């Protein structure tokens, strides 16, 4: 404290009516109960997901932000409302509305509620254009899904989007999404426990092993959700492959582990042993506090894992505050 939570999500107060004007049965809208405190995300006229009032409603969130030790919270879209599968124009039309909706959300208090914007990533131009229009309008950066939906980061198109954002000092949060294991992982929220970490790790490696970091300006500010999934733990596995296989080493001139200095992670790894190794790999300068609020699989006690750790005080302040102040340029 100043305490920054850079990983959380919102959903806009849109009517099914307005949603249908985009798509009648594939654009998400928000159903609210009589007594406000509950509701649900809807796809068609049929329920999609039940949802906490904290997801929308900036006023209710602030009270929770006060109850948590949380001064500033960055929030961006729920992966559902991405729409990387729609027509390019309908998506870019949709993109702008959510981003304006996000600012109507951060209008309730623009000091404590910062917002990242979404792009139509299926269309490079519109994506790049939407990004600058939104960051200039007051969004602090961009949140993208981690793939789309079959050729991963590394794809020269997505590399180009990263160059655009890097050239204009646009910060990126990369979020795992649209996993991933097919017709498996049906129970116990397995996609969140197995697939999400894997997606996130895939995205990172796809940048390192393609040698994308050799072509992208160091101006690139890029953060990866959920501690970078399983990346930090499996890194030694990767270096070993790099050392014994020409194919792993062909587009990657340095040991993959060299590249940790070209990206950020959030701290959401839910375990002191694991947070320690994450910092050991990433450096205290490259780990930012994120909660994944207000999702049940997020951190309930926001900052509790960091504050309670055997990390230095120097390290704690950077993670809780220092790193996100510079990354997003917040003061």
- Which residues are annotated as part of the binding site for Zn(2+)? 7, 9, 175, 292
CB burial readout 118-132, b (16+ within 10 A) else e: bbbbbbbebbbbbbe
Which of 48, 135, 130, 145 has the alpha carbon at shortest distance from 88? Answer: 130
Give the interface with its own copies as residue ranges (CB under 8 A). 147, 150-152, 154, 180-185, 187-190, 192-195, 197-198, 201-202, 205-206, 209-210, 226, 229-230, 232-241, 244-245, 247-248, 250-252, 269-271, 273-274, 277, 280-281, 296-297, 299-300
Which of the listed partners (Zn ion, its own copies, none) does 292 bind, with a CB threshold of 5 to 8 Å by partner kind? Zn ion
Residues in 221-250 at the binding interface with Zn ion, rule: CB under 5 A:
none
In the annotated binding site, the residues are: 7, 9, 175, 292
Considering the complex, what minimum distance in angstroms separates the CB of residue 264 from Zn ion?
15
Which of the listed partners (Zn ion, its own copies, none) does 238 bind, with a CB threshold of 5 to 8 Å by partner kind? its own copies
Backbone angles phi, psi at 137, to 5 degrees: -65, -15
Q: Which is nearer to its own copies, 36 or 181 (CB)?
A: 181
Is the peptide bond preceding residue 149 cis, with omega within 30 degrees of 0?
yes
* Beta-strand runs (E) in the chain: 4-5, 9-10, 29-32, 38-42, 47-52, 72-77, 113-117, 141-145, 172-175, 222-224, 264-266, 287-288
Q: Which is nearer to its own copies, 89 or 240 (CB)?
A: 240
CA distance 288 to 222: 11
Which of the listed partners (Zn ion, its own copies, none) does 188 bind, with a CB threshold of 5 to 8 Å by partner kind? its own copies
Considering the complex, what minimum distance in angstroms separates the CB of residue 106 from Zn ion?
18
Q: Which is nearer to its own copies, 92 or 209 (CB)?
A: 209
Residue 51 bridge partners (DSSP): 39
Considering the complex, what minimum distance in angstroms separates the CB of residue 229 from Zn ion?
12
Alpha helix (H) ranges present in 108-187?
124-137, 156-167
In the annotated binding site for Fe(3+), the residues are: 7, 9, 175, 292
CA distance 130 to 93: 10
Residues in 256-295 at the binding interface with Zn ion, rule: CB under 5 A:
292
Considering the complex, what minimum distance in angstroms separates the CB of residue 125 from Zn ion?
27
Which residue do the tokens 């990004």 mark?
A: 131
Considering the complex, what minimum distance in angstroms separates the CB of residue 294 from its own copies?
12
Considering the complex, what minimum distance in angstroms separates the CB of residue 211 from its own copies?
10
Question: How far apart, in Å, are the Cα atoms of 198 and each of 191, 226, 228, 320?
Answer: 9, 11, 9, 25
Which of the listed partners (Zn ion, its own copies, none) does 60 bind, with a CB threshold of 5 to 8 Å by partner kind? none
Q: Which residues bind Zn ion (CB under 5 A)?
A: 292
């Amino acid at each position: 404290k100043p305490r920054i939570d850079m990983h959380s999500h919102f959903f806009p107060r849109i009517s099914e009516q307005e949603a249908a004007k985009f798509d009648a049965n594939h654009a998400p809208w928000l159903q609210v109960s009589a007594k406000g405190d509950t509701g649900s995300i809807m796809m068609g006229k049929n329920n999609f997901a039940p949802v906490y009032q904290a997801l929308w409603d900036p006023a209710f969130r602030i009270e929770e932000m006060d109850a948590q030790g949380v001064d500033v919270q960055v929030t961006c879209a729920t992966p559902v409302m991405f729409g990387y599968t729609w027509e390019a124009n309908k998506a870019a039309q949709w993109a702008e509305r959510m981003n304006d909706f996000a600012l109507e959300f951060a209008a309730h208090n623009p000091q404590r509620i910062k917002v990242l914007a979404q792009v139509p990533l299926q269309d490079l131009d519109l994506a790049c254009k939407e990004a600058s229009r939104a960051v200039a309008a007051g969004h602090l950066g961009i949140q993208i899904g981690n793939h789309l939906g079959d050729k991963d980061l590394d794809d020269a198109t997505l590399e180009a989007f990263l160059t655009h954002c890097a050239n204009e000092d646009i910060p990126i949060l990369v979020h795992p999404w649209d996993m991933m294991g097919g017709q498996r992982m049906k129970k116990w929220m397995l996609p969140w426990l197995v697939a999400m970490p894997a997606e996130t790790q895939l995205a990172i490696l796809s940048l390192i092993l393609s040698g994308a970091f050799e072509r992208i300006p160091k101006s690139l500010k890029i953060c990866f959700g959920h501690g970078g999934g399983s990346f930090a733990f499996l890194l030694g596995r990767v270096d070993n492959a790099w050392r014994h296989r020409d194919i792993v080493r062909e587009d990657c001139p340095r040991p993959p582990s060299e590249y940790v200095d070209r990206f950020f992670v959030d701290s959401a790894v839910f375990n002191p042993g694991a947070l320690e190794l994450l910092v050991s790999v990433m450096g205290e300068d490259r780990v930012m506090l994120g909660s994944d609020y207000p999702f049940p699989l997020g951190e309930q006690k926001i900052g509790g894992l960091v504050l309670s750790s055997n990390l230095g005080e120097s390290a704690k302040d950077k993670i809780i505050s220092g790193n996100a102040s510079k990354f997003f340029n917040i003061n």
